[PDB]
């Protein structure tokens, strides 16, 4: 008896679709996260039920109570990766370097079964109890790949300090692009601290400057000659000639052994 009621302690985080809450097993005391929400939440939830890997936030099911929607998700008591960056400064390079092998295998669990996440971000990167990096919120995402047949993208959404520049500039284009983009601007976030630009387009200077390859200016100045030079190959301007997370994986920075 009672191990289906829940306390619901403290308000996780807020959101356009309402709020999250830590909620507490009244029988267990198990922790878990409920999403509350006041097309859109049916898609939601239809490929969170989809999910099974150990760095994408797990579902436990979903809950109807009239006009609300219950969403049951991981509560990851680390927190918000956004949490362990350090304004103007970053994090410790190893914890970056860990932080970016978790994301690239969740992100390749993700595509390997055709879904794209659409809004890779700090706020959207979880941490459980062993700093293990969890990939959440799939409000924006979407089937990219059915039955092996890949369909392009035409939607503009996600955030624009993280969005690819073909989003800006082309009618339709790959889903997979997009999500690398999106990751090495959690990169340059997770070692430098801030932000390069506010979007990637001709008109902003920091992204014109950093075509023209100004890596004597912040946050590339910051940044050390390994890791930048995998940033140098993740924020091409044309998602075709951008680096695939396959030879990611094949990086110099990426397989160099680091401790603090
Ligand atoms: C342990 O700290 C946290 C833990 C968590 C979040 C924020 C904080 C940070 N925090 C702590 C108190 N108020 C904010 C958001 C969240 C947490 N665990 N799980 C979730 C979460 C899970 C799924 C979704 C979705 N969609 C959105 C959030």
């Known amino acids: 008896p009672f191990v289906e009621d829940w306390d619901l302690v403290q308000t996780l985080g807020e959101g356009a679709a ?9 029988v267990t005391e198990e922790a878990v996260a409920v999403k509350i929400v006041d097309e859109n939440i049916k898609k ?8 099974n890997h150990e760095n994408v936030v797990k579902f436990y099911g979903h809950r109807r109570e009239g006009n609300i929607q219950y969403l ?33 295998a969740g992100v390749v ?22 700093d293990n990096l969890k990939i959440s919120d799939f409000g924006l995402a979407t089937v990219f790949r059915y039955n092996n047949r ?43 601290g801030e932000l390069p630009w506010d979007q990637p387009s001709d008109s902003c200077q920091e992204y014109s400057d950093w075509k023209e390859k100004k890596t004597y200016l912040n946050p590339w100045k910051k940044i050390d ?8 190959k993740i924020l091409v301007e044309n998602p075709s000639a951008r680096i695939t997370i396959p030879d990611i994986k094949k990086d110099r920075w990426y397989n160099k052994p680091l401790k603090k």
């Open 109 to 130: 669990y993700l595509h390997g079964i055709g879904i794209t996440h659409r809004d890779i971000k700090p706020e959207n990167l979880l941490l459980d109890e062993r």
């Open 150 to 192: 890949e369909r392009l993208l035409n939607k503009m959404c996600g955030t624009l300090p993280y969005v690819a520049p073909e989003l800006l500039k082309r009618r339709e284009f790959h889903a997979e692009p997009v999500d690398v983009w999106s990751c090495g601007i959690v990169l340059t976030a997770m070692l430098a």
């Open 225 to 232: 000659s390994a890791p930048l030079a995998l940033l140098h």
């Open 72 to 104: 049951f998700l991981e509560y990851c008591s680390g927190g918000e990766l956004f949490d362990r960056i350090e304004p103007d400064i970053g994090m410790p390079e190893p914890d970056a370097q860990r932080f970016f092998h978790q994301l690239m």
């Open 18 to 26: 309402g709020e999250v809450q830590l909620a507490v097993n009244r």
């Open 44 to 51: 939601e939830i239809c490929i969170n039920k989809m999910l």
